[PDB]
Amino acid sequence: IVGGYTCGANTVPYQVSLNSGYHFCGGSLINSQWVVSAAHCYKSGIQVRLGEDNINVVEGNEQFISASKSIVHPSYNSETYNNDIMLIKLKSAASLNSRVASISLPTSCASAGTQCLISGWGNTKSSGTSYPDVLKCLKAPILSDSSCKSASSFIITSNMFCAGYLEGGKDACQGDSGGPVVCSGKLQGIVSWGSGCAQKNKPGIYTKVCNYVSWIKQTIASN
Ligand SMILES: CC(C)(C)OC[C@@H](NS(=O)(=O)Cc1ccccc1)C(=O)NCC(=O)NCc1ccc(C(=N)N)cc1
Ligand SMILES: [Ca+2]
């Protein structure tokens, strides 16, 4: 997260870190057994880490749980990142508490201008690299597709939205991949892609979660 702030320990209790020897992606706890992340975060040997603040120190509120199944969306396109969403089933149920909590899925999509909270342990610099050990947060509005497309020249599919600031300075970044965009208490976005970080006219692009709720529900019912 570039141009954000230190969240405070366990203030984003649905935020998970995916670990394969090191933190490599975020994710969001959606019930005691399931995490939503980005399809581009898929790999074998994922351990889900819940209740994290400092990812390098055991502070006492963590739960580390192996993935039993990973399910990349059937239509994920790794060339364009269309349908950039994956479900991870935990080997055992998380013990839900004030620091390890689920976030609700949307009933309806969010409109342009809606303010959201984006979080993660990704790079905090627009130029060069520094990786924070504690969770960082950013407030950002959803942008209209038309303003986003005209400013950036990006192709925005129906399954993507832009959020952030066209003036630059505030954005998600590498290492925030898979993490939540929460708006009015609903998981509306997943950190997906962009061009650099926090650059003028290059806002962040997010998987449009509301389009996937039927898939998520059916998948959970059958797995
Ligand atoms: C067109 C597509 C195949 C999707 O790839 C575009 C690619 N853009 S990039 O400019 O390579 C992403 C990047 C940004 C900073 C350092 C290194 C890489 C990209 O974003 N690749 C995936 C990726 O790196 N995702 C992480 C990410 C998270 C947030 C942001 C952001 N909001 N600015 C950008 C990339
Ligand atoms: Ca920790």
Q: Tell the residue nearest (CA) to atom 34 of ligand 1.
A: 194
Residue 119: domain span: 1-12+103-210
Residue 164 near residue 25 (C-beta atoms within 8 A):
no
Rounded to the nearest 5 degrees, what angle is found at the Cα of 25, between the Cα atoms of 22 and 30? 120
DSSP letters for 32-97: TTEEEE-GGG--SS-EEEES-SSTTS--S--EEEEEEEEEE-TT--TTT-TT--EEEEESS----B
Whether residue 177 lies in the annotated active site: yes
Per-residue b/e over 46-76, b at no fewer than 16 CB within 10 Å?
A: bebbbbbbebeeeeebbbebebeebbbbeeb
Going by the DSSP 8-state scheme, the letter that residue 155 receives in this structure is -
**Could you tell me the distance, in angstroms and rounded to a whole number, from the CA of residue 162 to the centre of ligand 2?**
31
Residue 33 near residue 93 (C-beta atoms within 8 A):
yes
Q: In this structure, are 5 and 111 located in the same domain? A: yes
Q: In this structure, are 123 and 65 located in the same domain? A: no
Residue 15 near residue 25 (C-beta atoms within 8 A):
no
Residue 39 near residue 83 (C-beta atoms within 8 A):
yes
Most ligand 1 atoms within 8 A of CB, residue of 83, 174, 206 to mutate: 174
How many domains does the chain divide into?
Answer: 2
Listed residue (206, 209, 207) closest to 188, CA to CA: 209
Q: In this structure, are 183 and 77 located in the same domain? A: no
Rounded to 10 degrees, the C-alpha dihedral 119/124/127/128 comes to -130
